Design an enzyme around this catalytic site. Structure first.
Site, PDB file in Angstrom:
ATOM      1  N   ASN A 210       3.950   3.446  10.258  1.00  0.00           N
ATOM      2  CA  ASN A 210       3.586   3.970  11.572  1.00  0.00           C
ATOM      3  C   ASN A 210       4.242   3.172  12.681  1.00  0.00           C
ATOM      4  O   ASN A 210       5.005   2.249  12.410  1.00  0.00           O
ATOM      5  CB  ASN A 210       2.055   4.086  11.762  1.00  0.00           C
TER       6      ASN A 210
ATOM      7  N   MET B 254      -0.139  -7.394   7.174  1.00  0.00           N
ATOM      8  CA  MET B 254      -1.098  -8.415   6.781  1.00  0.00           C
ATOM      9  C   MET B 254      -0.927  -8.958   5.380  1.00  0.00           C
ATOM     10  O   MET B 254      -1.917  -9.216   4.696  1.00  0.00           O
ATOM     11  CB  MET B 254      -2.499  -7.824   6.897  1.00  0.00           C
ATOM     12  N   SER B 255       0.312  -9.169   4.956  1.00  0.00           N
ATOM     13  CA  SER B 255       0.561  -9.694   3.619  1.00  0.00           C
ATOM     14  C   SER B 255       2.024 -10.081   3.501  1.00  0.00           C
ATOM     15  O   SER B 255       2.743 -10.099   4.495  1.00  0.00           O
ATOM     16  CB  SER B 255       0.255  -8.619   2.592  1.00  0.00           C
TER      17      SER B 255
ATOM     18  N   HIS C  16      -9.295  -0.110  -7.604  1.00  0.00           N
ATOM     19  CA  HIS C  16      -8.769   1.244  -7.822  1.00  0.00           C
ATOM     20  C   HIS C  16      -7.441   1.349  -7.066  1.00  0.00           C
ATOM     21  O   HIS C  16      -7.289   2.145  -6.123  1.00  0.00           O
ATOM     22  CB  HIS C  16      -9.764   2.326  -7.358  1.00  0.00           C
TER      23      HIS C  16
ATOM     24  N   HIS D 281      -5.040  -9.826  -0.568  1.00  0.00           N
ATOM     25  CA  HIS D 281      -4.889 -10.032   0.864  1.00  0.00           C
ATOM     26  C   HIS D 281      -5.837 -11.084   1.374  1.00  0.00           C
ATOM     27  O   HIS D 281      -6.932 -11.257   0.857  1.00  0.00           O
ATOM     28  CB  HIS D 281      -5.168  -8.772   1.631  1.00  0.00           C
TER      29      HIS D 281
ATOM     30  N   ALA E 123       3.492  -2.228   3.525  1.00  0.00           N
ATOM     31  CA  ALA E 123       3.503  -1.175   4.531  1.00  0.00           C
ATOM     32  C   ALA E 123       3.230  -1.886   5.836  1.00  0.00           C
ATOM     33  O   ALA E 123       2.318  -2.707   5.901  1.00  0.00           O
ATOM     34  CB  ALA E 123       2.424  -0.171   4.254  1.00  0.00           C
TER      35      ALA E 123
ATOM     36  N   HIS F 109      -5.435   2.667   7.299  1.00  0.00           N
ATOM     37  CA  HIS F 109      -5.001   2.688   5.892  1.00  0.00           C
ATOM     38  C   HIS F 109      -5.496   4.065   5.504  1.00  0.00           C
ATOM     39  O   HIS F 109      -4.829   4.808   4.778  1.00  0.00           O
ATOM     40  CB  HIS F 109      -5.747   1.653   5.042  1.00  0.00           C
TER      41      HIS F 109
ATOM     42  N   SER G  55       0.833  -1.206   0.000  1.00  0.00           N
ATOM     43  CA  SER G  55       0.000   0.000   0.000  1.00  0.00           C
ATOM     44  C   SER G  55       0.860   1.246   0.000  1.00  0.00           C
ATOM     45  O   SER G  55       1.725   1.408   0.866  1.00  0.00           O
ATOM     46  CB  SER G  55      -0.937   0.042   1.215  1.00  0.00           C
TER      47      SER G  55
ATOM     48  N   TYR H 292      -7.206 -10.972   4.319  1.00  0.00           N
ATOM     49  CA  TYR H 292      -8.304 -10.231   4.941  1.00  0.00           C
ATOM     50  C   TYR H 292      -9.366  -9.762   3.981  1.00  0.00           C
ATOM     51  O   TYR H 292     -10.402  -9.280   4.407  1.00  0.00           O
ATOM     52  CB  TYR H 292      -7.804  -9.055   5.780  1.00  0.00           C
ATOM     53  N   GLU H 293      -9.088  -9.837   2.687  1.00  0.00           N
ATOM     54  CA  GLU H 293     -10.061  -9.450   1.681  1.00  0.00           C
ATOM     55  C   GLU H 293     -10.907 -10.686   1.353  1.00  0.00           C
ATOM     56  O   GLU H 293     -11.694 -10.669   0.411  1.00  0.00           O
ATOM     57  CB  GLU H 293      -9.359  -9.009   0.393  1.00  0.00           C
TER      58      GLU H 293
HETATM   59  C1  LIG Z   1       1.155   0.365   9.585  1.00  0.00           C
HETATM   60  N1  LIG Z   1      -0.146  -0.247   9.312  1.00  0.00           N
HETATM   61  C2  LIG Z   1      -0.316  -0.474   7.887  1.00  0.00           C
HETATM   62  N2  LIG Z   1      -0.489  -1.809   7.666  1.00  0.00           N
HETATM   63  C3  LIG Z   1      -0.692  -2.426   6.353  1.00  0.00           C
HETATM   64  O1  LIG Z   1      -1.093  -1.370   5.359  1.00  0.00           O
HETATM   65  C4  LIG Z   1      -2.427  -1.592   4.769  1.00  0.00           C
HETATM   66  C5  LIG Z   1      -3.160  -0.386   5.377  1.00  0.00           C
HETATM   67  O2  LIG Z   1      -2.790  -0.113   6.762  1.00  0.00           O
HETATM   68  C6  LIG Z   1      -2.866  -3.030   5.270  1.00  0.00           C
HETATM   69  O3  LIG Z   1      -2.939  -4.026   4.165  1.00  0.00           O
HETATM   70  C7  LIG Z   1      -1.774  -3.501   6.335  1.00  0.00           C
HETATM   71  O4  LIG Z   1      -1.128  -4.767   5.980  1.00  0.00           O
HETATM   72  C8  LIG Z   1      -0.430  -2.477   8.947  1.00  0.00           C
HETATM   73  N3  LIG Z   1      -0.548  -3.801   9.217  1.00  0.00           N
HETATM   74  C9  LIG Z   1      -0.466  -4.179  10.514  1.00  0.00           C
HETATM   75  N4  LIG Z   1      -0.586  -5.589  10.870  1.00  0.00           N
HETATM   76  N5  LIG Z   1      -0.265  -3.224  11.517  1.00  0.00           N
HETATM   77  C10 LIG Z   1      -0.127  -1.830  11.310  1.00  0.00           C
HETATM   78  S1  LIG Z   1       0.130  -0.662  12.661  1.00  0.00           S
HETATM   79  C11 LIG Z   1      -0.232  -1.522   9.878  1.00  0.00           C
END
Ligand SMILES: C[n+]1cn([C@@H]2O[C@H](CO)[C@@H](O)[C@H]2O)c2nc(N)nc([S-])c21
Length: 288
Positions: A242, A218-219, A63, A85, A115, A256, A32, A87-88
Site C-alpha cells: 500500500n 515492522m520486521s 495459521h 514479530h 510487506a 493487514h 505477509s 509487535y507480537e
Molecule cells: C503496508 N502495510 C503492511 N505492513 C506490514 O504487513 C503486515 C500487515 O500489514 C505487518 O506485519 C506489517 O509489517 C506495514 N507496515 C508498516 N510499518 N506500514 C504499512 S502502511 C504496512
C-alpha cells in the site's frame, strides 16, 4: 543473543538435521502474503515451529506459521512461513532465533521478504522493492537483536551493517528482473523498520519520509542483522502492499485485514521472482 545459549541453537540445529534429510543453503523468510512460496518447493518437508526444540511457537498467526524444507529452483531451501514479530511480544532474540539456527543448518544465504507501505511517492502499490538498505529505528533505542553478550561463535561484537544487503545479489536481481522482461523496473530503496502493531499516523509517515525511508514495515531488520552477524549473504524484497498517506488528505485505509496487494497476485510475482533468483544465489560449490 540472550535467552538462548549456544547449545540451544545447537540442539535445535542438530534436531532439525536429524529430522530432515535436507541440508539447506538458502533460508527464505516469507512476509505477509508471500507465504505461498511454500508451494513452489519440491521434496517439501514441513515442521510446525511448535514441534522444533527451542523454536518460538506462534502466538496467534500460527495459521500462517511453519518451517518448510524443500528445494526451490535448483537450490536447497528452508522456508519460514509466518515470521516472528516484535509487535507480537517476541523479544528480538526470539524473532531472530531462526536465522541463528538456519546458519547452524549450513545455511549461507537468507532472502528476507516482507510487506511494507510505500513511503516513496514513486512506489505504486504492488511494487516490489529490492532492499538496498534499512533504517533500524528500534535498533537506535536498544531493541537490537544483538544486545547482550556476543557469541564470538556466530560473529563479531560490532557487525558492519553498511554492507548488509549483498551488493552482488542486488545487481543480479535488478538484471534478472530485466531478463524476465517485466517492464516496471524492480524498485529499490531503504527499508525502515518500525515496531508496534499500530499503523503510522500522517505525521509519523512524514518523519519516515524525511529520515529517508522508501518503505515502512515492522520486521526484517532484526533478521538481516543477526544474519549478517553470522556472515550469511542477505538480500530481500518488500512487497509495497500500500501507499502511506503523507498529506492530511488521508482517509484511505490499508490494514493487514486488507493486505490486498498481498491479498492478490502482486505477491505471486515476488514469489516467482524469488524462485528465479535461486539460480543467481552462488552455490557453496562455486565450481569455477
Ligand atoms: C503496508 N502495510 C503492511 N505492513 C506490514 O504487513 C503486515 C500487515 O500489514 C505487518 O506485519 C506489517 O509489517 C506495514 N507496515 C508498516 N510499518 N506500514 C504499512 S502502511 C504496512
Amino acid at each position: 543473543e540472550n535467552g538462548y545459549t549456544y547449545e540451544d541453537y545447537k540442539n535445535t540445529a542438530e534436531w532439525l538435521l536429524s529430522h530432515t534429510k535436507h541440508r539447506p543453503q538458502v533460508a527464505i523468510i516469507c512476509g505477509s502474503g508471500l507465504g505461498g512460496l511454500t508451494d513452489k518447493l519440491t521434496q517439501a518437508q514441513i515442521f510446525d515451529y511448535s514441534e522444533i526444540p527451542n523454536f518460538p511457537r506462534s502466538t496467534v498467526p500460527g495459521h500462517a506459521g511453519r518451517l518448510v524444507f524443500g528445494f526451490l529452483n535448483g537450490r536447497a531451501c528452508v522456508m519460514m512461513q509466518g515470521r516472528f514479530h516484535m509487535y507480537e511480544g517476541y523479544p528480538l532474540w526470539k524473532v531472530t532465533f531462526p536465522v541463528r539456527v538456519f546458519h547452524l543448518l549450513g545455511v549461507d544465504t537468507l532472502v528476507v521478504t516482507n510487506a511494507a507501505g510505500g513511503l516513496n511517492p514513486k512506489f505504486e502499490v504492488g511494487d516490489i522493492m529490492l532492499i538496498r538498505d534499512h533504517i533500524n529505528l528500534p535498533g537506535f533505542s536498544g531493541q537490537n537483536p544483538l544486545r547482550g553478550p556476543n557469541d564470538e561463535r556466530f560473529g563479531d561484537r560490532f557487525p558492519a551493517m553498511s554492507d548488509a544487503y549483498d551488493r552482488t545479489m542486488r545487481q543480479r536481481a535488478l538484471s534478472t528482473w530485466k531478463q524476465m522482461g517485466e517492464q516496471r523496473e524492480l524498485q529499490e530503496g531503504t527499508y525502515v523498520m518500525v515496531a508496534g502493531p499500530s499503523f503510522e499516523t500522517v505525521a509519523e509517515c512524514r518523519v519516515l519520509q524525511k529520515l529517508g525511508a522508501d518503505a515502512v514495515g515492522m520486521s526484517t531488520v532484526p533478521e538481516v542483522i543477526v544474519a549478517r552477524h553470522c556472515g550469511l549473504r542477505v538480500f530481500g524484497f518488500s512487497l509495497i502492499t500500500n501507499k502511506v498517506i503523507m498529506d492530511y488528505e488521508s482517509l484511505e485505509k490499508a490494514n493487514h485485514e486488507e493486505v490486498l496487494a498481498a491479498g492478490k497476485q502482486a505477491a505471486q510475482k515476488l514469489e516467482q521472482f524469488v524462485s528465479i533468483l535461486m539460480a543467481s544465489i552462488p552455490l557453496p560449490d562455486k565450481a569455477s
